[PDB]
Write a protein that binds this ligand. Structure first.
Ligand code: SF4
Ligand code: SF4
Ligand code: FES
Ligand SMILES: [K+]
Ligand SMILES: [Zn+2]
Lengths: 125, 95, 48, 688, 207, 114, 86
């Protein structure tokens, strides 16, 4: 037999996270920008959730990068913006959502390179 | 070569040396600062330039498959030598 | 090595060293890179 | 209506005529391999990696260049297609050098990755390889041309985007070489972009050389503050250090390019940094002290001064959060002398109406204009990406461009009317022939540079230019929605300051010299101790020791734009926020926190303890400052023009001469770029 | 039979497909999906209410006889509203065959305990509760099994950090082991490894 | 919003299980101090138990309450059966953690953490 | 304890800001002529409730909702601020 529970989903007290890392963090929900060094677009398909960067310092012995932020490497993947937002809400994280950036559709034409009277005529091939 | 700072601490081949007032040099008191003495930048300069009769020479570091990936070096500029990007050996085109 | 001598190189140690742990010759680790951020040094004259 | 049906592997898709096979595949989420094709460059069709089979056609077609035909079925994964890719990859790699371990492209290389996905897994080439001599094209781009695959992307970008016809191909056949033929430096304000579009390690960043590998970097998507365009960037960091700057695609701002100052000035963030609070000792020399001591000395003075005895100046790289925090702190001692270094005339509407000081047409609107009038500006160096947008419209929409000012080289030919500001009156009065051009245009754009407003007659010039834009809209022909009047800003913090009610320029500080002065990152040298009473208490908050710090009584180390989440408004009025890439060095602190901390020590606590709360305070002063990535329209140009007539001011005889006339003046404009050793190399390169 | 390519086995593929729809015909009340992979593994995806009826049928039916519970585990997929996928791997000795039964649940929905069907499931469900926080109803003895006493959180969830939140050391003042917030001398270095070029067109999702 | 319950049909039934758990913990503190030879008093132990219940007083979902109770009983059983050691029982008191002042100025002096 | 600054927030297209849009269209020019040295910051933003903010000496601020006000009501809300100073 089912029951009715109309309140919002809030699992912050049964996830075991320290309170500091719930209420002081800022999740960013975004689709990663394409790496401009490459033309492939396969890494701009899914939504990502990451957290705000915190202090890294140099280890006195070696000079390694030390951190005290347990969430420094936490990155989650979501199919849609709604999935990511819903996950952030139930875990108690404040968040910013950045709208997906899709490349504009362009009008390409090989013929324009040899225009009779336009500036698109190319001086070299 | 391995120099010493005005404090006496040896300078590594990467140019590292604790400065006058850096507490971290206490780790060497009663012990020593490990410093490799054979500086590779000085050793590779000791090698003589090799004279070749072609515009393009190849290098694999020597030793065949014990060397580095084989690369081809252009020797068209006369103002300088071609340098292997892996092992640092130098080549020049004779006249 | 009396029969098959090793190949000679100008950088190979001529004198072998045994394990030096626990002695003043022991290895002490340290960062081999130089300082990353250069700090502003204030001037040495009162112009203010 | 005119869409035609084509099939990608049997899946129907409706595409406009003129769409290429490659673009048709994109619509079903299939990315055809490519090397020479770039969607923002002219079509080349020379690498042949995009060859794809059309069903029933015996010949594979170049997908990047071939328009689709109705009913065509593109077999993106047929054996005929796969064998074509394997053959081309085999030719591409035949002479390519075995350089991956020493090549900076390694790990983010299109040749590596496409060889993995579309090529064979072995070689059958049993000959010696070609080797090419490298070529020196300046201090920013290193060339290892034996890696070049002759895709000509760099040539097309230099010609079309950068407007520099310096790169080309010499020789022919297998010996064909990309370069400049002669010894020449490719020193354009957009030159660094060719590193990004070169698919291989032939062109790489000299400053970045050998320092990192792609897989180990963390990408912080952020905003550029080197100018007022607000180019979207990726800050690459590793193990707590900033490694390089990359562009981030934003179609309506920077597309996928950044300027060379944006790309290479980050090395100024590792130099001359302010890392500890400083106070003057009993000999009058700055000495390190604690935050507790430093703020207490500031709070004591703040508690003892009121009204016009306290002033502040905001510099060019200041974020909105610090701006509102500083304003609130000074207001609570009844001070209103919150100034910026960058002047904007206050006559008439002043800063009351956003439309008076915005680029109301927006950057993307340049592509819809048919005429552009540039008045007293050098957009090439003031806003390189904005100038790139103009050349894009000049190239593709046959835009007509005219300039009032000095005849600078803008990379595109333009009509030069002159440099006399009096010409503005002639155009308005109808005397000038160009007056007919403005009347006959459906979408005219009049852009006035903020640099011209730094003259002593800025108000007259703004009144003159607004008059021209006013007459254009009264005469009709231009639709009501179109915006004709624009201001091109060059300072990252200017629009946010004006949105918040800062007074533009330091004229107020000159009328009433204050006893206590806050220099919030103010390094323009607009106020010195000659302009202040002998006992002035000067506090400098900032991240660099440049001009403001050495004259200060108290130095408070703040964060740079890479070290804080802070809000900036670009010249369009579009608010954007940076993200923390690394933390501020040493004892430096987030800028708005320093002011909030000071307000508590002085018993004047500001009502916000977190970044979210201070952004709420921003919304209460200008609600658009929290609408991130949104361009908020501003209206009432009529009222602004009405008020700009009330007081007449004289136009001087001085011709309009921009501060930056050649590239050498472009590299060092702010405190970060002035501390950049790379920017110093660029200046040396273009002056020797 | 190309030497580097794994050979297909269509006979096994056919047999497992036929049995897949056999199970779907008999338990339509609970079966939501049946699929057979290209390497011949059969999966039955069911409603969570069917855990006991479905598992009992596969164990006891004369044409099934899946007597052995090889493995019971969970997978966390945060993008799903029911983020936890519960996976039963069963072995039939009589028919020399394997089958996978999958269901789902969220953080707050109990799953019926399968100990009545398989006594082997006892510790597997304790592990799932410990590492994922999925509650199993009517478990004779549900408690942590792998984590430390008093450990907070469920480490195998995708949003639990790799190094956790606390670490241990010996403290001389209190003369005992203590737990303190985690600090790392060298932070774990996240690598971004994925190539931006698609690898497997056969699996491309529609746009 | 029709969901399968865990134990409690609504908050009224859940708060009954909460009170039952609180009694069990309250009675157990005297044994825990004695058995583990802790150097704290029964008053401190029961104040700590009270502090643990209080932090969750704001919950209104019966399912969440049920899971908190389930964990509470698991924690209690670990303590009663001496599966926990003294180090585990004392981790609730964080005796080695230095004070971390929670006012804006104090954080400002020490670092960047909000 | 005088008046230091006025800010007017409104939407460019919502019907709730129509009265504020009319006031700016007809009366802002004359209002600015009477108070040349008074910053009156108009800040439009999409889908915001119109408000009139007034800042007094020492950073005291009060705000008045202008939602659905007519142009005449906007003139009174501003007249009360410019006169009933505090
Ligand atoms: S360009 Fe690419 S394939 Fe060529 S050496 Fe560099 S990383 Fe390797
Ligand atoms: S240098 Fe790079 S971008 Fe230019 S043609 Fe060669 S491979 Fe293409
Ligand atoms: S991408 Fe089409 S031939 Fe190069
Ligand atoms: K490149
Ligand atoms: Zn070599």
């Amino acid at each position: 037999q089912l029951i009715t529970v109309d309140e919002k989903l809030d699992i912050t007290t049964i996830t075991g996270v320290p309170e500091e890392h719930i209420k002081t963090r800022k999740a960013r929900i975004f689709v990663p920008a394409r790496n401009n060094m490459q033309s492939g677009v396969n890494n701009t398909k899914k939504w990502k959730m990451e957290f705000d960067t915190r202090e890294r310092w140099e280890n006195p012995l070696m000079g390694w990068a030390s951190t005290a932020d347990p969430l420094s490497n936490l990155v989650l993947t979501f199919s849609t913006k709604e999935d990511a937002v819903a996950f952030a809400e139930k875990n108690g994280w404040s968040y910013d959502v950045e709208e997906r950036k899709v490349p504009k559709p362009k009008s390409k034409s090989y013929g324009a390179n040899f225009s009779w009277n336009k500036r698109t005529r190319v001086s070299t091939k | 070569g391995v120099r010493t700072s005005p404090t006496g601490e040896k300078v590594t081949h990467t140019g590292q040396v604790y400065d006058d007032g850096d507490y971290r040099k206490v780790r060497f008191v009663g012990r020593q600062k490990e410093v490799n003495e054979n500086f590779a930048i000085d050793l590779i300069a000791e090698q003589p330039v090799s004279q070749v009769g072609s515009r393009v020479i190849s290098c694999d570091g020597g030793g065949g498959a014990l060397g580095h990936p084989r690369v081809y070096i252009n020797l068209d500029k006369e103002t300088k030598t071609g340098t292997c990007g892996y092992c640092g050996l130098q080549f020049r085109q004779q006249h | 090595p009396t029969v098959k001598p090793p190949t000679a190189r100008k950088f190979i140690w001529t004198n072998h060293k045994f394990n030096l742990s626990g002695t003043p010759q022991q290895y002490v680790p340290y960062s081999t890179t130089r300082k990353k951020i250069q700090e502003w040094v204030p001037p040495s004259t009162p112009y203010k | 209506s005119n869409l035609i049906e084509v099939f990608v592997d049997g899946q129907s898709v409706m595409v406009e005529p003129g769409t290429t096979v490659l673009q048709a595949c994109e619509k079903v989420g299939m990315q055809i391999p490519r090397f020479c094709y770039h969607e923002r460059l002219s079509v080349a069709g020379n690498c042949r990696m995009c060859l794809v089979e059309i069903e029933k056609a015996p010949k594979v077609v170049a997908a990047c260049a071939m328009p689709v035909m109705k009913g065509w079925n593109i077999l993106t994964n047929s054996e005929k297609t796969k064998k074509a890719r394997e053959g081309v990859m085999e030719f591409l790699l035949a002479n390519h050098p075995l350089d991956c371990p020493i090549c900076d492209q390694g790990g983010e290389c299109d040749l590596q990755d496409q060889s993995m996905m579309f090529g064979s897994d072995r070689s059958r080439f049993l000959e010696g390889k070609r080797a090419v001599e490298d070529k020196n094209i300046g201090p920013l781009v290193k060339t290892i041309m034996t890696r070049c695959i002759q895709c000509t992307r760099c040539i097309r970008f230099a010609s079309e985007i950068a407007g520099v016809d310096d790169l080309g191909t010499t020789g022919r056949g297998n010996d064909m070489q990309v370069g400049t033929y002669i010894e020449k430096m490719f020193m354009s304000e957009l030159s660094g972009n060719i590193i990004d579009i070169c698919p291989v390690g032939a062109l790489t960043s000299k400053p970045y050389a050998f320092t990192a590998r792609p897989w180990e970097t963390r990408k912080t998507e952020s905003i550029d503050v080197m100018d007022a365009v607000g180019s979207n960037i990726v800050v690459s960091t590793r193990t707590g250090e900033v490694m390089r700057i990359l562009p981030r695609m934003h179609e309506d701002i920077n597309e996928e390019w950044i300027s060379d100052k944006t790309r290479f000035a980050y090395d100024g963030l590792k130099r001359q940094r302010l890392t500890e609070p400083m106070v003057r000792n009993e000999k009058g020399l700055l000495t390190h002290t604690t935050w507790e001591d430093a703020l207490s000395r500031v709070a004591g003075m703040l508690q003892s001064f009121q009204g016009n005895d306290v002033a502040a100046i905001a510099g060019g790289l200041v974020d909105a959060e610090a701006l509102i925090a500083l304003k609130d702190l000074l207001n609570r001692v009844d001070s209103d002398t919150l100034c910026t270094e960058e002047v904007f005339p206050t006559a008439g509407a002043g800063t009351d109406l956003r439309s008076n000081y915005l680029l109301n047409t927006t950057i993307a609107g340049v592509e819809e204009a048919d005429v552009v009038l540039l008045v007293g500006t050098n957009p090439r160096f003031e806003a390189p990406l904005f100038n790139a947008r103009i050349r894009k419209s000049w190239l593709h929409n046959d835009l007509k461009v005219a300039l009032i000012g000095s005849p600078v080289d803008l990379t595109y030919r333009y009509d030069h009317l002159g440099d006399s500001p009096k010409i503005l009156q002639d155009i308005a009065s109808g005397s000038h022939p160009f007056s007919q051009v403005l009347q006959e245009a459906k979408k005219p754009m009049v852009i006035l540079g903020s640099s011209a407003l730094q003259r002593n007659d800025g108000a007259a010039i703004l009144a003159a230019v607004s008059n021209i834009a006013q007459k254009i809209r009264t005469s009709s022909g231009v639709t009501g929605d179109w915006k004709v009047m624009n201001i091109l800003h060059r300072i990252a913090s200017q629009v946010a300051a004006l949105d918040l009610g800062y007074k533009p320029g330091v004229e107020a500080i000159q009328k009433n010299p204050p006893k206590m002065l806050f220099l919030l990152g103010a390094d323009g040298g607009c106020i010195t101790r000659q302009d202040l009473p002998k006992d002035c208490f000067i506090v400098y908050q900032g991240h660099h020791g440049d001009v403001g710090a050495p004259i200060a009584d108290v130095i408070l180390p703040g964060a740079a734009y890479t070290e804080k989440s802070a809000t900036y408004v670009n010249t369009e009025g579009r608010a954007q926020q940076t993200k923390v890439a690394v933390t501020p060095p040493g004892l430096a602190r987030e800028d708005w926190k320093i002011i909030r901390a000071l307000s508590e020590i002085a018993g004047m606590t500001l009502p916000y303890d977190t970044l979210d709360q201070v952004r709420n305070r921003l919304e209460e002063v200008s609600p658009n400052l929290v609408r991130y990535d949104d361009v908020e329209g501003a209206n009432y140009f009529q009222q602004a023009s009405e008020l700009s007539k009330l007081v007449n001011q004289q136009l001087l005889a001085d011709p309009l001469v921009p501060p930056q006339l050649t590239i050498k003046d472009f590299y060092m404009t702010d405190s970060i770029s002035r501390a950049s050793q790379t920017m110093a190399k660029c200046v040396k390169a273009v002056t020797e | 039979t190309r030497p580097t390519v794994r050979p297909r086995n269509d006979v096994a593929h056919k047999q497992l497909s036929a049995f897949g729809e056999y199970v779907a015909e008999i338990l339509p009340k609970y079966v939501q999906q049946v699929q057979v992979s290209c390497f011949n593994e059969l999966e039955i995806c069911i409603h969570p209410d069917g855990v006991i009826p479905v598992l009992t049928f596969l164990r006891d039916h004369s044409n099934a006889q899946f007597k052995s519970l090889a493995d019971l585990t969970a997978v966390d997929i945060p993008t799903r509203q029911n983020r936890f996928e519960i996976v039963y791997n069963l072995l039939s000795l009589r028919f020399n065959s394997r089958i996978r039964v999958k269901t789902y649940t969220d953080e707050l929905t109990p799953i019926e305990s399968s100990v009545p069907v398989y006594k082997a499931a006892n510790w597997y469900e304790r592990e799932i509760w410990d590492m994922f926080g999925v509650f199993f109803a009517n478990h004779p003895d549900l408690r942590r099994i792998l984590t430390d006493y008093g450990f907070e959180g469920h480490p195998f969830r995708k949003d639990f950090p790799l190094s956790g939140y606390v670490e241990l050391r010996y403290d001389d003042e209190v003369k005992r082991v203590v737990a303190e917030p985690v600090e790392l001398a060298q932070e774990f270095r996240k690598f971004d490894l994925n190539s931006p070029w698609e690898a497997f067109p056969a699996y491309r999702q529609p746009p | 919003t029709s969901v399968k319950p865990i134990f409690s049909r609504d908050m009224n039934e859940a708060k009954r299980r909460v009170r039952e758990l609180y009694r069990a913990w309250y009675r157990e503190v005297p044994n825990t101090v004695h058995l583990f030879q802790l150097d704290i008093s029964v008053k401190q132990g029961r104040d700590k138990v009270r502090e643990m219940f209080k932090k969750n007083a704001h919950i209104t979902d019966p399912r969440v309450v049920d899971l908190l109770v389930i964990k509470g009983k698991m924690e209690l059983e670990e303590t009663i059966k001496v599966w926990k050691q003294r180090t585990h029982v004392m981790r609730f008191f964080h005796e080695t953690e230095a004070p971390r002042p929670k006012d804006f100025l104090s954080k400002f002096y020490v670092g960047h953490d909000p | 304890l005088g008046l230091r600054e006025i800010r007017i927030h409104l939407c460019q297209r919502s019907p709730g800001s129509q009265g504020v849009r009319d006031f700016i269209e007809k009366r802002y020019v004359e209002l600015k002529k009477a108070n040349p040295d008074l910053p009156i910051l108009i800040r439009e933003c999409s889908d915001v409730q119109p408000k009139l903010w007034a800042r007094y000496a020492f950073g005291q601020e009060k705000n008045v909702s202008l939602n659905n006000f007519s142009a005449d009501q906007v003139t009174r809300a501003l007249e009360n601020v410019l006169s009933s100073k505090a």
